[PDB]
Ligand binder design. Sequence first.
Ligand SMILES: Nc1ncnc2c1ncn2[C@@H]1O[C@H](COP(=O)(O)OP(=O)(O)O)[C@@H](O)[C@H]1O
Ligand SMILES: [Mg+2]
Lengths: 338, 14
Amino acid sequence: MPKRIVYNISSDFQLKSLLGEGAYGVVCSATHKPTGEIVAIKKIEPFDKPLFALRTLREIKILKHFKHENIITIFNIQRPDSFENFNEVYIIQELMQTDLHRVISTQMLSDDHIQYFIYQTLRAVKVLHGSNVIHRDLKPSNLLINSNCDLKVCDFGLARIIDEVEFVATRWYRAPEVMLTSAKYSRAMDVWSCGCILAELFLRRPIFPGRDYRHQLLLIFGIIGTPHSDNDLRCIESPRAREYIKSLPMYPAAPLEKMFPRVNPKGIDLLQRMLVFDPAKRITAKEALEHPYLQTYHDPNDEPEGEPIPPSFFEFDHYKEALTTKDLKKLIWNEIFS
Amino acid sequence: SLQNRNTKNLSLDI
Ligand SMILES: Nc1ncnc2c1ncn2[C@@H]1O[C@H](COP(=O)(O)OP(=O)(O)O)[C@@H](O)[C@H]1O
Ligand SMILES: [Mg+2]
């Protein structure tokens, strides 16, 4: 473990291995000496820009809220010894052996494995959508996996509750409507991501590896087809976007069965139901669990629907004046000691 | 955990 990584946590803890390092979070495995339990500890420095604190607060409340086999389990949050000396948040959670990205890049999955992995992903998404929560950042590296093949979603900082400078979700998994029209968060965007994830499981590489906005759209449409009609161009309302779409080559829907010659026809079927342009026609998470491809694991009675979360659960996001770092520090402290 | 649903005992050597 890199000498540069420093965790201001109880000395009963002993860092083991560094599992993830990013500008937002740093994840290390660690042993809690007295119990011998090995856990995962995510460290976040949230007080340099409200933006970081906000993410942190959202990730925390979400984790504490759910108790689902497919959503990573939070054991606790390190308690600072003083408000004055509170500069990092340490989320202690269940240790997993890896993420799906690592699995795709080093393992040949049978069709069984894919069926099961995507099934769990969808199941997690259902409970989220049913509580009116959307992840917004679903991708293979945020799906944790154990050797028995259990899968759990992690990274809830970009989540939002549905209603009537920022961290951006990787574009290879962004739905075309988000990239175009001024998108009011929807359940369909997450399904689009799952769709990219399933495709990646079949392809063993990302299906839409765009280098930028333009290229990204050029790749997506090259697969699902260029939308032409106005009924088709409805969902999009911003003129420049209509115009941009019209200046694109007119691609037909690419024949997937010919793309994935050895992929299960049922898998491709489900795939095509997720990667659809019009978010309103895109299959829902529940529906997807009901699809024939997941028949081996589907069970209408063991697929939690969740319960609605109101918009004020993330109240701190809807203030006239933005909250200060101190206001946010309080809010996080409140979640840690509750 | 959802192991009770892993009807086929799927594994991964990690
Ligand atoms: N509970 C966990 N067990 C094992 N590895 C984890 C765990 N949580 C995160 N990781 C590892 O850390 C990486 C980043 O964690 P994530 O929670 O998505 O934070 P970030 O905001 O940095 O993306 C994951 O891709 C995964 O490899
Ligand atoms: Mg992440």
